[PDB]
Amino acid sequence: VGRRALIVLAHSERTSFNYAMKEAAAAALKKKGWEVVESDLYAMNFNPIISRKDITGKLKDPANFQYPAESVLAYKEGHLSPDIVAEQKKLEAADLVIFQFPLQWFGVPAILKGWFERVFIGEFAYTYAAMYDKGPFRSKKAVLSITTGGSGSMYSLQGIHGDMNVILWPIQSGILHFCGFQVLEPQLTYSIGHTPADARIQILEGWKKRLENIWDETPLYFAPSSLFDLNFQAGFLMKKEVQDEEKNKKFGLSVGHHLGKSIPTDNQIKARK
Amino acid sequence: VGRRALIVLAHSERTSFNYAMKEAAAAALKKKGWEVVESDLYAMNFNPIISRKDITGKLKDPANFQYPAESVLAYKEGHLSPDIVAEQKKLEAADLVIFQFPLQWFGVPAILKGWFERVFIGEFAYTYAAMYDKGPFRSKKAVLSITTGGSGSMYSLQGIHGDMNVILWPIQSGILHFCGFQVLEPQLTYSIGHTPADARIQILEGWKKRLENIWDETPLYFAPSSLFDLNFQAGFLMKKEVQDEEKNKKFGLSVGHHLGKSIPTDNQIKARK
Ligand SMILES: Cc1cc2nc3c(=O)[nH]c(=O)nc-3n(C[C@H](O)[C@H](O)[C@H](O)COP(=O)(O)OP(=O)(O)OC[C@H]3O[C@@H](n4cnc5c(N)ncnc54)[C@H](O)[C@@H]3O)c2cc1C
Ligand SMILES: Cc1cc2nc3c(=O)[nH]c(=O)nc-3n(C[C@H](O)[C@H](O)[C@H](O)COP(=O)(O)OP(=O)(O)OC[C@H]3O[C@@H](n4cnc5c(N)ncnc54)[C@H](O)[C@@H]3O)c2cc1C
């Protein structure tokens, strides 16, 4: 199980449905005995812009500044900016991490994107030596709770926007899973601005209801790293044996690993595969 | 053709390859007679966080602030922050827009994501009435010039990060094409951190040579809006006739419109309708 949860909110208005979803989550969790911490990015006036100021000490190569290396070094020697360190301490303590935000330009709000860039620092959050399912957060579970302006049909296979599974991929696989998180099914709330007040009410109650057994859910399916040649002189490509065993299979493995074939239905939205 | 170009750069270091790429583009375009304008976000001390601070007038409703509606009203009544107005003026004049940036967490840097959120205001950059094909920037062309830490094989169909075409979709379709932009093939320079001094110089030269005829390039293929019933009533789904006639094709129309079938090879990387 997990007794600790962190809720990262990315919305400036306390009168928003997003703020209401954050409160709903914290209420349901505390009631079931969880310890709940929050990161209201707008409320904290969080700094989302990566810079050399994220390193407190003196740099290794100040004339040729490379963020990845200088930040990793700062993480190891203990001199990352203290606002960054405070967020990293919350992350370390949490078993479950909920990201509550409105979809903005088919992605995460800039302030949340900056939170990832500044907080998910090398070694602490990820290592090329232990990628994806073997990452640092492999004992943690993450969930995206998203609100949208567009309707669900707009995001279906035949909607103008296209499949929502493709939109979710960069985030759930590229950011969350890459660091080791077991990613749970996303809570998707479409066209919230066109939803009746009573439906909005049931949406909040259905979220609280889901959170009651969230930890026991089966996570989304991502191709295991055991299928890849985790080394540079190999190009981190799928192992030869694995490649063959797949050539006779109708479907691809995931949205990103579709292998030029059909992507299993709702790979990024529903768990079962 | 187009005589005016806007280069938006998102990198904090003047010593980076990204900065080098921007300087190469500027030089190359000016040489061929282009009028070049720049938006060096970091150097412009650019604010990427959307808030009610983006509106200078009175809010139509300060009780429950809703950014989409208020910013659209501000654009119409002329109440947008001076920095947004200046960027909108740059965009309005430009024929070609180049976005130069390093890949950060499978997406654009927070500062650039924020630039889109604050600059691409409704009415100005888009209208739900004239989405994609009929968007405001339909007479403009855009291009993404991206650098990455990971190698190309890592982003191939068998690479551990998965298909790069999926990563590029949210940006090129969801942001650029949605506003009307014709999107040209992206310039992708992989593992720039493991490329010899000799090889990087040719990259710069290769980029410069491409820009000499960039305007006469065949743009990437996105399903036309004519294939969809564009109304809340219809749910914005593909026209029935299209769905049927499409059922006999092997490949879907694009990454986002894969229709549960195979994704056309390099739909977001290579042009070929
Ligand atoms: C820059 C930008 C880019 C965007 N890009 C996209 C995009 O790419 N794709 C897309 O689909 N959408 C996009 N949107 C739209 C955005 O996704 C929606 O505006 C957002 O998800 C709406 O959520 P909200 O919390 O702001 O709700 P609000 O607009 O605040 O609305 C909440 C609604 O619920 C009511 N409410 C509030 N609290 C409660 C409560 N406790 N109980 C019951 N009812 C309550 C409110 O009165 C209101 O009717 C974009 C918006 C912006 C500003
Ligand atoms: C927060 C964050 C998240 C990231 N997420 C990802 C991700 O999801 N996927 C991924 O693949 N990568 C990721 N990266 C890595 C990032 O994409 C690379 O570090 C970046 O693209 C390198 O580009 P750069 O312009 O900074 O170059 P630099 O590291 O500066 O390197 C440029 C090289 O070219 C040399 N050079 C400079 N100017 C010139 C010139 N004029 N002519 C010739 N040579 C020159 C430099 O000295 C140096 O050796 C991430 C990095 C950060 C900080």
- The burial of A112, by beta-carbon neighbours within 10 Å (0-12 exposed, 13-18 middle, 19 or more buried), is given as buried
For ligand 1, atom 15, name the residue with the nearest CA. Answer: A149
**Structure tokens given for A107:** 């992605």
For ligand 2, atom 36, name the residue with the nearest CA. Answer: B17
To probe the interface with A, which of B42, B258, B261 has the most A CB atoms within 10 Å? B258
In this complex, the residue of B65, B107, B170 whose CB is nearest that of residue A113 is B107
Shortest distance, CA A205 to any CA of chain B (angstroms): 22
| SS3 label, residue A59 | coil
Q: How many CB atoms lie within 10 A of CB A64?
A: 10
Q: A62: Cβ below 6 Å to ligand 1?
A: no
Residue found under tokens 């739909």: B267
- The burial of A239, by beta-carbon neighbours within 10 Å (0-12 exposed, 13-18 middle, 19 or more buried), is given as middle
How many H helices and E strands in chain A? 7, 6
Q: A194: Cβ below 6 Å to ligand 1?
A: no
DSSP A226: G
Residues in Cβ contact with A86 at an 8 Å cutoff, skipping those fewer than 6 apart: none
Chain A partners of B11 at a C-beta cutoff of 8 Å? Answer: none
To probe the interface with B, which of A19, A49, A147 has the most B CB atoms within 10 Å? A49
**What whole-number distance in Å separates Cα of residue B250 and Cα of residue B262?**
7
**What whole-number distance in Å separates Cα of residue B148 and Cα of residue A138?**
25
* HEC letters along chain B: CCCEEEEEECCCCCCCHHHHHHHHHHHHHHHCCCEEEEEECCCCCCCCCCCHHHECCCCCCCCCCCHHHHHHHHHHHCCECHHHHHHHHHHHHCCEEEEEEECECCECCHHHHHHHHHHCCECCCECCCCCHHHCCCCCCEEEEEEECCCCHHHHCCCECCCCHHHHHHHHHHHHHHHHCCEECCCEEECCHHHCCHHHHHHHHHHHHHHHCCHHHCCCCCCCCHHHECCCCCCCCEECHHHHHHHCCCCECCCCCCCCCCECCCCCCCCCCC
Q: Which of B22, B23, B99, B104 to mutate to test the pocket of ligand 2 (most atoms within 8 A of CB)?
A: B104
Ligand 2 centre to CA of B153 (Å) is 17
The one catalytic residue among B57, B128, B149, B206: B149
**What whole-number distance in Å separates Cα of residue B106 and Cα of residue B109?**
9
Best CA proximity match to A273, nearest among A262, A209, A234? A262
- Closest ligand 1 atom to residue A103 Cα is 17
The one catalytic residue among B132, B155, B180, B252: B155
Answer whether CATH 3.55.40.20 is correct for domain A1-273.
Answer: no
**Helix axis angle, B164-171 to A164-171, nearest 10°:** 110
Q: Do A151 and B236 touch (CB under 8 A)?
A: yes
Beta bridge partners of B99: B8, B144
Ligand 2 centre to CA of A84 (Å) is 22
**What whole-number distance in Å separates Cα of residue B57 and Cα of residue B76?**
11
- Closest ligand 2 atom to residue A174 Cα is 8
In this complex, the residue of A110, A170, A261 whose CB is nearest that of residue B117 is A110
Cβ pair B95, B1 in contact under 8 A: yes
H/E stretch holding A247 reads helix A240-247
Ligand 2 centre to CA of B192 (Å) is 6
Q: Is B155 an active-site residue?
A: yes
In this complex, the residue of A105, A162, A170 whose CB is nearest that of residue B117 is A105
State which residue of chain A sits closest to B235, comparing Cα positions.
Answer: A153
Residue found under tokens 């990087």: B200
